[PDB]
Design a protein around this ligand. Structure first.
Ligand SMILES: Nc1nc2c(ncn2[C@H]2C[C@H](O)[C@@H](COP(=O)(O)OP(=O)(O)OP(=O)(O)O)O2)c(=O)[nH]1
Ligand SMILES: Nc1nc2c(ncn2[C@H]2C[C@H](O)[C@@H](COP(=O)(O)OP(=O)(O)OP(=O)(O)O)O2)c(=O)[nH]1
Ligand SMILES: Nc1ncnc2c1ncn2[C@@H]1O[C@H](COP(=O)(O)OP(=O)(O)O)[C@@H](O)[C@H]1CCO
Ligand SMILES: Nc1ncnc2c1ncn2[C@@H]1O[C@H](COP(=O)(O)OP(=O)(O)O)[C@@H](O)[C@H]1CCO
Ligand SMILES: [Mg+2]
Ligand SMILES: [Mg+2]
Lengths: 640, 640
């Protein structure tokens, strides 16, 4: 690799596809002109010694799919990547650019994959999430929506697609005097388009459906591994958009009615008591097919046990506690179950994501620098706002959405690292408290920075009439007082006076690849193993420190699922600290998820981990988080 | 069934879908009002004794899929169908309506299936053929075209789709700096849409491709029955759009070059010598991949031997001898290889079809009433023009095409019946002459009627600059004098002075189901068996007449493939007369096809029948019809 950043940018800008002779610049006109106008300042700002902030699997992560290539050879050093992204985000604001380069290079936070991939390049598609409305219950709306999904999927970013408006199997078609074959054949069309289109030369969509839809029994079964094949769509992910009524009927052991949307209009366009009144009326009018609620329930659990899906997101929780409720009824989340944003046939919700590296704020005894965290969170908030304006939107429905409501999604990684570093068991009171105070500071920081942005550039277009315009912040919608490490009254006073620039700011995402770069555990989940063929950095230090680290102890970690429990000669304090996620009660997981959720605007991608899975255990877990008021009750079910 | 036509129309108009309570009228507002305004005249015109013009399999054909149903019970008698169609075609012109009812009821001609199905109903989609241009080499054009195919396929009618502009496997994509996976993955998308959409609640498309396209080797193999599966599209039909150059290179045992359309632009938008100059230049410029022509050729024949496809239509023949050549370059035919009409991204060629029942004009000794044939052909021509104006077009590209150029497609059925009735072997000089004089009269009749229509309503919009505006009729483009049973000079004089109303008028189609209704053999092919478990009506009469019809003779027809050759006690005159298509030289088939083609404006769906098929025999057959100047060199290859 060439060392000088400005020479790397030149090579990239001047790139020509040799096989075709076509100029194929890999830097935008804009960022090139900026680098060239400031090349001494930029070249000498990079500290190339920081490529040793990464590790074997973290560097080989970047080198393998993030660092831009010329002719199949890596052309970017990691610091070049980071400065390219800083510039791609900040443009002419060199000071901002320099601050972002410095904080990212020292691993305080990072932006999501699409940003890392595309910032600073000619069609910079930096947004990770698209939430698409099925446009209409017609061939035309179906094929228009399919086309919009193909165009989005050509430029990277997952899709959450809601399809509650498509009439079900056996329904009448007036134009041809025929009968619909329902959702499964249509899903199969979408499945083929996700396969055909492979991010520019493969798609992953999540499909959302309310569980009164009459094809629901087949919908939930789409990833099943066994027999029928023309009834399965194994490259898509089903997600349930569950009303509280469903959960009530199941716990009551009552009935549930399945409708075609054409027989029972408007269900997905209301929520809560209004839904409950409309749904019960349609029930009483003989407009659908009644079954035992617990019959559906059983089939759901059986599909989650075999496939890990469907996902579970609670419709009424998502709508009652959204700052976007003045926009209309929200009808989906997204591929990874963290975005809850409004979508409609002309508005495709988009989000831009970044994660704070929670261990960077640890400082004999260790403490956590919340003031540095608040400061970094505001930096990241401002970055993500800037991404909104600098983004290439693959379809017009997505520009119109984002330009109007300007949502953002801050998250985190290395929560488990943080606890371990601080010697707190995951299930400890200390870890409970740290969880709350971390999320409280991130949300405060985000809102303070967004309010600063509203005083500068004006509130987002639809701020007026929002819960936040009336001083109702997220934790107020959960009917709770905040923990109070930060002054929320002054914040709220300023927000009601001056607005905020972003409708939403927090959606802790999976970080499935960005944590790997930084060398931390993903998002907010415990560790899954203390051995991945390398052992937990923290565990290792301790074992060595106690003189019990030997071969005959290395083995009971390879052989034993990366768990240290039961291991004869290990102190109990290590055992508590290094519990694996299969060893931590999911009630504790659900509890901590509820604690943090009061400070999460959107939702969070809560995977669930069941070791010895029974239909009864799984039911308790769903009902426990449902009654906790969780929005995303479940992302994947990981088993066995 | 109710007997009175006006009461049947009432029941149909007033129909309500009981399961949904939705009024679902099965007659148009327009035709209902006409019937009700003329109900005595219409009711008393029907001769209900004519439902015994049909046979076991012909009635049970109509009853099973043509005659309109209420609640799953047939509501229409055949005469009701015919009067409904007559009205649907003619509207307020009751006299015309009455004449068409009379001639169809006595089985002189019929209209194609979509007309029979849909005439007189609220969205009367009466056209059988759509020829669609791939709109653009982009995701957007691909998905727009897919949507147009789904919308067309919702209302019945086959699609011929041309895809020569889609860049091939391995080609560069600049927007995503990636690589195309080529045609086969895209075909697979179209295959899934044909399956999803099943004529209103399954599609059949033919795909057209010129054989220089770089994915051609996989394209031709798509219906193959054996291994790979993600490289096959078994609900679509590949058709080759072959330039003369290809055939020359193969016979020369030279080379052939494969290009991506992005490396060699404009190939499909020229023909003949201009194509040959552009193609050779691109060859010399190293823009593609050179192979042995005969290597492609071999693979084509191997696919035709296994699958019956690809079809073969000759691009340069189709363009050099089209009255539509002032429109631009024609880039496909259609599902059944008879329509050759211009299409483009904003113009989808449509055609409306009907067949003359050739035996109706037979009158000790038998003669053929050509004057009655000419008269009926003009009746049918005028019907098909009227269909153009009364049609519901499923997409705007198809209305714009048809309204502009007004093509039509007359054809025939029961050619083989006719010969047999007249005691002429298929391969006889008498049958050769009858073939020519039949097609000469149909074409003359069509053009005379279309000229009458142009004096009344004006020529079609693009008539000016057409070969016909300059007095070049179809047989002139083949450099031949007509047989001269009719006065062509007076016709041409009038056409050059007053125009014609239709750009094209003749495309003998398969009649795969309409012949069955009428009880005749399909279109213009010999019989395939003298036994289908019932024997040839004509053969039967003869065997009985000779006192050789017994059980021990019935068997050597069941056991012997419906062939009478070799059969000890049958006269030679029967043997010659009742040759099966596996027993008639394909050179004779090709010869008669060439004779008739000088009077066929578009093309004709020429199936080929090879008993003992070798690569050498098949080559001769292709080269024989190619050098005869055939447009459709081959539709299906039927084997074994
Ligand atoms: N399988 C697959 N094919 C694609 C993908 N994206 C584009 N293609 C194909 C479709 C077309 O035949 C060709 C060009 O597509 P587009 O026009 O949409 O690509 P773009 O305009 O961004 O690049 P271009 O300037 O035309 O080379 O490449 C993809 O993501 N997956
Ligand atoms: N499988 C299949 N589904 C179809 C077909 N045609 C329509 N559908 C489905 C798609 C939609 O979910 C629903 C309605 O489609 P359209 O709006 O295109 O039907 P149309 O407007 O002619 O009848 P409508 O008035 O809406 O009942 O039926 C078809 O031909 N095959
Ligand atoms: N296979 C895939 N294709 C496209 N988008 C994907 C994807 N897997 C995840 N995403 C999208 O990436 C977002 C965050 O997932 P995350 O796992 O945090 O991504 P990175 O660590 O790679 O930045 C999610 O919010 C999801 C979009 C939601 O509609
Ligand atoms: N399976 C199918 N689906 C849709 N259209 C079809 C079809 N099979 C044939 N056709 C369409 O029907 C036309 C004439 O075929 P023919 O076999 O003469 O039809 P009928 O005897 O049923 O009237 C052809 O010109 C083809 C359209 C060309 O694009
Ligand atoms: Mg509709
Ligand atoms: Mg393009």
């Amino acid at each position: 690799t060439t060392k000088q950043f400005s020479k790397v940018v030149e090579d990239l800008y001047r790139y020509v596809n040799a096989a075709t002779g076509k100029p194929a610049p890999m830097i935008s006109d804009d960022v090139y002109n900026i680098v060239m106008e400031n090349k001494d300042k930029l070249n000498s700002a990079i500290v190339y010694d920081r490529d040793f902030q990464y590790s074997y699997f973290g560097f080989k992560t970047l080198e393998r799919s993030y660092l831009l290539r010329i002719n199949g050879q890596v052309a970017e050093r990691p610091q070049h990547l980071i400065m390219r992204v800083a510039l791609g985000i900040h443009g002419r604001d060199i000071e901002a650019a320099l601050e972002t380069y410095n904080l990212m290079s020292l691993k305080y936070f990072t932006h999501a994959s699409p940003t890392l991939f595309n910032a600073g390049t000619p069609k910079p598609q930096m947004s990770s999430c698209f939430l698409v409305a099925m446009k209409e219950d017609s061939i035309e709306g179906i094929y228009d929506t399919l086309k919009e999904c193909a165009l989005i999927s050509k430029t990277a970013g997952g899709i959450g697609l809601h399809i509650h408006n498509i009439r079900s199997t056996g329904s009448y078609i007036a134009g041809t005097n025929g009968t619909s074959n329902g959702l499964i054949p249509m899903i199969r069309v979408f499945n083929n388009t996700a396969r055909y289109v492979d991010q520019g030369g493969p798609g992953a969509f999540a499909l959302y459906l309310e569980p009164w839809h009459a094809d629901i029994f087949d919908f939930i079964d789409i990833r099943k591994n066994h027999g029928k094949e023309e009834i399965r769509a194994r490259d898509l992910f089903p997600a349930l958009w569950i009303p509280d009524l469903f959960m009530k009927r199941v716990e009551e052991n009552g009935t549930w009615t399945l409708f075609s949307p054409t027989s029972a209009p408007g269900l997905s366009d209301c929520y809560g008591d209004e839904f409950e009144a409309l749904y019960t009326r349609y029930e009483k009018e003989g407009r659908g097919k009644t079954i035992k609620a617990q019959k559906l329930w059983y089939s759901i659990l059986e599909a989650q046990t075999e496939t890990g899906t469907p996902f579970v997101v609670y419709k009424d929780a998502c709508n009652r506690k959204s700052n976007q409720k003045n926009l209309g009824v929200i009808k989906s989340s997204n591929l990874c179950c963290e975005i809850v944003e409004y979508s409609a046939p002309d508005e495709t919700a988009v989000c831009n994501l970044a994660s704070v590296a929670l261990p960077a704020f640890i400082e004999k005894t260790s403490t956590y620098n919340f003031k540095k965290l608040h400061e970094i969170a505001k930096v990241v908030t401002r970055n993500l706002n800037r991404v909104i304006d600098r983004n290439y939107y693959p379809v017009e429905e997505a520009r119109k959405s984002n330009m109007r409501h300007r949502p953002i999604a801050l998250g985190v990684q290395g929560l488990a690292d943080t606890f371990m570093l601080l010697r707190l068991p995951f299930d400890s009171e200390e870890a409970r408290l740290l969880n709350i105070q971390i999320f409280e500071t991130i949300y405060h920081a985000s809102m303070e920075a967004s309010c600063e942005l509203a005083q500068k550039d004006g509130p987002y277009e639809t701020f007026q009439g929002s819960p936040a315009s009336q001083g109702i912040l997220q934790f107020d919608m959960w009917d709770q007082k905040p923990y109070g490490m930060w002054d929320w009254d002054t914040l709220r006073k300023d927000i009601m006076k001056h607005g905020v620039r972003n409708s939403l700011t927090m959606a802790p995402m999976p970080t499935a690849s960005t944590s790997q770069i930084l060398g931390y555990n993903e998002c907010f989940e415990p560790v899954t193993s203390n051995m991945y063929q390398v052992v937990n950095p923290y565990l290792l230090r301790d074992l060595v420190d106690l003189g019990i680290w030997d071969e005959g102890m290395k083995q009971y970690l390879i052989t034993q699922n990366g768990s240290i429990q039961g291991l004869p000669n290990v102190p109990q304090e290590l055992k508590d600290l290094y519990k694996t996620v299969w060893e931590i009660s999911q009630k504790t997981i659900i509890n901590m998820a509820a604690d943090r959720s009061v400070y999460i605007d959107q939702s969070h991608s809560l995977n669930l981990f069941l070791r010895a899975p029974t239909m009864g255990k799984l039911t308790s877990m769903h009902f426990y988080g449902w009654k906790k008021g969780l929005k995303t009750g479940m992302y994947y079910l990981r088993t066995q």
